[PDB]
Amino acid sequence: AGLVDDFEKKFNALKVPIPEDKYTAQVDAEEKEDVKSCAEFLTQSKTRIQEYEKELEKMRN
Amino acid sequence: LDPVQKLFVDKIREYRTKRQTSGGPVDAGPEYQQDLDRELFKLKQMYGKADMNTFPNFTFEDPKFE
C-alpha cells in the first residue's frame, strides 16, 4: 500500500499540463483574407455603389 | 455437530497452525513458488509489462490543422 499511497499522493497531486497547438497563426491568416474582404471589396464596393446608385437618380431623370 | 465442526475446527486449527507456521510454499513445500513466479509473471502479461509499480506519466499532444 506504499505503492497505492505513493500513486495516491501522486494522483492527488497529479495535474496535467494542457495540449499543444500551433495554428494561432490562423488568427492572422485570417487578418490578410480579413483585409481582402475589407480593402478589395469593402472600398471597391462602396465606391462602385456610390456612382451606380447615384447613377440611378440622374439617368432616372 | 463439532466432529463436523471439529473438522471445520480441524482444518481451522491448521488455519492457525499453518497461518502461524507461514503458508505459501511453506507448510506446503516448494511447489507454490515454482508456479508462483510464472503465475505472477502472467499477471505482468495480464497488464502488459508496463510496470504496474511505477507511477505513470501522461501525454502532451497536438492534432493537425493549417
From Swiss-Prot, chain A:
The modification N6-succinyllysine is found at K15, K22, K32. The modification N6-acetyllysine is found at K9, K15, K22, K32, K54. GO terms for cellular component: mitochondrial inner membrane; mitochondrion; proton-transporting ATP synthase complex. It is found in: Mitochondrion; Mitochondrion inner membrane. Subunit d, of the mitochondrial membrane ATP synthase complex (F(1)F(0) ATP synthase or Complex V) that produces ATP from ADP in the presence of a proton gradient across the membrane which is generated by electron transport complexes of the respiratory chain. ATP synthase complex consist of a soluble F(1) head domain - the catalytic core - and a membrane F(1) domain - the membrane proton channel. These two domains are linked by a central stalk rotating inside the F(1) region and a stationary peripheral stalk. Belongs to the ATPase d subunit family. This is ATP synthase peripheral stalk subunit d, mitochondrial. It comes from Bos taurus (Bovine).
Curated annotation (Swiss-Prot), chain B:
The keyword Ribosomal protein does not apply. One of its GO terms (cellular component) is mitochondrion. GO terms for biological process: proton motive force-driven ATP synthesis. It is found in: Mitochondrion; Mitochondrion inner membrane. The modification N6-succinyllysine is found at K49, K64. The modification N6-acetyllysine is found at K6, K11, K44, K49, K64. Coiled coil: none annotated. Keywords: Acetylation, CF(0), Hydrogen ion transport, Ion transport, Membrane, Mitochondrion, Mitochondrion inner membrane, Phosphoprotein, Transit peptide, Transport. GO terms for molecular function: proton transmembrane transporter activity. Subunit F6, of the mitochondrial membrane ATP synthase complex (F(1)F(0) ATP synthase or Complex V) that produces ATP from ADP in the presence of a proton gradient across the membrane which is generated by electron transport complexes of the respiratory chain. ATP synthase complex consist of a soluble F(1) head domain - the catalytic core - and a membrane F(1) domain - the membrane proton channel. These two domains are linked by a central stalk rotating inside the F(1) region and a stationary peripheral stalk. Belongs to the eukaryotic ATPase subunit F6 family. Component of the ATP synthase complex composed at least of ATP5F1A/subunit alpha, ATP5F1B/subunit beta, ATP5MC1/subunit c (homooctomer), MT-ATP6/subunit a, MT-ATP8/subunit 8, ATP5ME/subunit e, ATP5MF/subunit f, ATP5MG/subunit g, ATP5MK/subunit k, ATP5MJ/subunit j, ATP5F1C/subunit gamma, ATP5F1D/subunit delta, ATP5F1E/subunit epsilon, ATP5PF/subunit F6, ATP5PB/subunit b, ATP5PD/subunit d, ATP5PO/subunit OSCP. This is ATP synthase peripheral stalk subunit F6, mitochondrial. The gene is ATP5PF. The chain holds residues 36 to 101 of 108 of the full protein.
